[PDB]
């Protein structure tokens, strides 16, 4: 019983992830050299990428995190979600950088973006490791993108199937037999 | 030995409060007869008034509550507050009735008002037991008001000094010897 | 369309509730005359009763509130729940009084009781408006009880059916046709 | 202009951290091969270490997180803290692995340890990257330790001074001129 045996194929190895993280980190450090931004991750999936990205971003910055959950029907259509943990600091006047593992529908993330704008953020940018424009249900594009990927359910490096596989150091596609 | 000894004068007796609450309840019941509104109280102070008001509001309605805290000096400027407990249901398409004990500066309350408007509320109205408009730091008008009271620090019927005196059935003014 | 028309029969009218609230309040005020207890309500159902009870409790006290939600299978068997809003003050050394609308299974409430004991409460007592020893799934008895009632689903005065009827000023039994 | 100029000395380089993390990950993967543990990080500081550790832990596991804050002077005594974000799943019957960046006083961590034991955890173990046992205000031993470090205030790899320097890929000591 080993996780590797559940993966049909690899999409992005650890080597390529760390390479792209090094690239995005250096770009972000230069873009944010004249401000102390508030970098925000949405639990749970964004944590591994956010960890590796920010330690390749050589500039002063603060971290924070938010936890949200679905309301049921309203979340599936407008992205409105229940805030379980709000930010530990105010958004007003801050340059916000949202760090995400993947953008698929974009519903929830667009709700948070405009929420931070309602809270009078100085700016709101997005950096995502993976982008799936296929399943997009609102006009939302990330400012920084590590990889664009097909509409195929992947796992690893923060992305789960029923709360497991988040700890893989790579991203891959599960064998169809894994699903249940 | 007893709280009444700390009270210098009674500003609004229990009898007066229940008379106006009976009045407000009937008005609100008429205004919301063709909708199932979401009646929201902001902890902790609004709890006694919200309880007695909806007891007098003979119409179908749901209850919910929110808890917030300040970000320090940031809240004092725009009223932005940390959400500790969001609503249990979505705001979109709902008629929101915010139940408050008192509106003084209005900073925090206006922030929640436009938060719910950002969340696509069908309508957002405010009913407060006490209105202290002389303290406003923002333009915010309550739609339903029990009493308008002078620019003074009161206590009782939800309103606390250092977390005490909320359980008084009336609204009064403390003797200056109490402040420390 | 009026709520009264949905009630098959009344269990406790408003007059009897306020009478019992006056009785329990005076008992609690004497028992807690030599301490400033922390009175805690569990949202949402306990709010109306907690409001009326504490304003008939003529002694110094503090209020607080907690919000919890179910985990699924673990909540149905052991009462363990997710804390959505924790207390705003520490429990250590405090005399805790939990104010509840009804005790049926007792699972959740016994989890919170022993949680406060784990947090080194000086004492943990319970006051409940209604008690249904029928559906009890753990040995838990309230210290103060307003009314013992049969194993029949009631509504009003904080108790809901699908989030409605909480605002009734009395407790009654819905007509069977109301259910869906 | 750059953070490295604020650092007086590097205590544990990035290369050393990843070597030990690789070691810890393999050990933990062996110890948890016959269970699906719940790996819990305490925000914010544990995020970088937790990310790299589970990347090296080739076994099935779930991730979760908690957020807390202090009650003022009360936390300093028994470590009791306000829960801002509880776990997303129940603790009962689960093998809990708490992932920490550093253990200094141990007050807060011991409180969470016995909280999870109160919630009927099957087991509760602790892995910390850094151990500062000379600062203990309670008897708490970590089961897995990366490095033991002297009684000194460090920064980097999750550890902050006034919310900054978390994003350093190493652990260092600030120049005294930085403290204000
Ligand atoms: N494993 C995996 N997950 C995907 C994929 N695409 C989207 N998700 C996740 O599914 C959840 C719901 O996503 P959607 O709302 O449909 O799309 P969105 O990501 O654009 O919002 C999100 O987080 P969540 O799962 O609700 O939270 P968490 O897992 O981040 O804690 C998202 O991260 C994928 O290809 N693989
Ligand atoms: N006792 C008392 N309180 C007043 C009075 N006027 C305002 N407050 C309360 O003080 C807190 C902050 O007041 P302001 O910022 O000045 O006014 P605002 O609430 O309208 O913004 C609010 O709640 P809070 O105290 O932060 O929350 P909670 O106590 O409801 O939990 C508000 O309800 C008064 O005359 N007497
Ligand atoms: N209307 C009504 N409700 C009852 C009755 N008996 C129990 N409940 C409610 O159902 C929910 C689950 O109760 P149980 O866990 O089965 O029993 P317990 O009350 O002893 O814990 C509780 O709150 P909750 O509904 O989950 O939260 P909230 O409604 O207090 O927000 C409780 O208040 C009843 O006769 N009538
Ligand atoms: N930078 C740094 N921090 C240390 C050091 N030792 C302890 N801390 C952090 O300070 C906070 C309180 O520390 P103590 O109460 O003294 O030690 P304890 O965490 O073991 O109880 C904790 O997290 P926190 O800061 O309150 O939370 P967060 O920063 O993880 O969000 C802890 O992680 C150190 O040498 N350097
Ligand atoms: Mg997931
Ligand atoms: Mg107050
Ligand atoms: Mg209910
Ligand atoms: Mg810190």
Numbering used by the authors:
A (entry chain B), B (entry chain A), C (entry chain B), D (entry chain A): 0 to 179
Describing publication, verbatim:
HPRT is a purine salvage enzyme that converts purine bases and PRPP to GMP and IMP, which are precursors of the essential nucleotide GTP. HPRT activity was previously found to be inhibited by (p)ppGpp in several bacteria including Bacillus subtilis.
The HPRT-ppGpp complex diffracted to 2.1 Å resolution with two molecules in the asymmetric unit, and each monomer contained one ppGpp coordinated with Mg2+, in agreement with near 1:1 stoichiometry measured via ITC. These crystals formed in drops containing pppGpp, but there was insufficient density to completely model the 5′ γ-phosphate. Although it is possible that the γ-phosphate was hydrolyzed during crystallization, the presence of waters and unassigned density around the 5′ phosphates allow for the possibility that the γ-phosphate is present but dynamic. The guanine ring of ppGpp is surrounded by a hydrophobic cleft formed by Ile101, Phe152, and Leu158, and Lys131 hydrogen bonds the guanine’s exocyclic oxygen. In the HPRT-ppGpp complex, one side of loop II faces the active site while the other side is a critical part of the interface between two HPRT dimers.
